[PDB]
């Protein structure tokens, strides 16, 4: 094909950085290769930072854009998972994401928003509030939306790394039952 590559900014967290994976296995790297089959030669800027909250992304969006030799032709924004993990305010996550999308819109950079979903352990009130920020933002900022970015691994624990183990309340009881004998024996009489 003719011409310079199309520049796409992948602005997100561990899901873009490729946490736990080898060189070239991250979502941005594999997406770059897959777009060839759509007639697109892309250069995807991997601006994934593991652990980034919506606030962290807001704090760096201008610097990341100002650091680019070539202005992005599309920005893919994938943030909010770490706010969820931390149980942070969904309202504040929506405010922080609004600031990121406002900067992209100021620069006339098209947006694709990757929708995040809350798991049930946060409870229905939190989960409904969190989940609704993404459609709200996509309509407000005239952004395209992938409603559930992780949908294709939702029912596939074989496609997810064994990483953090946070026992549930019942899991804690299981651990206590297995280890209390050891603790009692270690405590001097």
Author numbering: 0 to 188
Sentences from the study reporting this entry:
Here, we reported the enzymatic characterizations and crystal structures of marine bacterial esterases CrmE10 and AlinE4. The results showed that both CrmE10 and AlinE4 belong to the SGNH-hydrolase superfamily and the bacterial lipolytic enzyme GDSL family. The SGNH-hydrolase family, a superfamily that includes the bacterial lipolytic enzyme GDSL family, consists of enzymes possessing four strictly conserved residues, Ser, Gly, Asn, and His, in four conserved blocks, I, II, III, and V, respectively. Among these four residues, Ser and His serve as catalytic residues, and Ser, Gly, and Asn serve as oxyanion hole residues.
According to sequence alignment, the catalytic triad of CrmE10 consisted of Ser29, Asp178, and His181, and it was composed of Ser13, Asp162, and His165 in AlnE4. In mutants AlinE4-S13A, AlinE4-D162A, and AlinE4-H165A, catalytic activities toward p-NP esters were almost abolished. However, the function of the Asp residue was barely investigated. Although the mutant AlinE4-D162A did not show significant variation compared with wild-type AlinE4, the B-factor of this loop was lower than wild-type AlinE4. In addition, one key residue (Asp162 in AlinE4/Asp178 in CrmE10) was found to be able to stabilize the conformation of both esterases and the metal ion Cd2+ reduced enzymatic activity by blocking proton transfer and substrate binding.
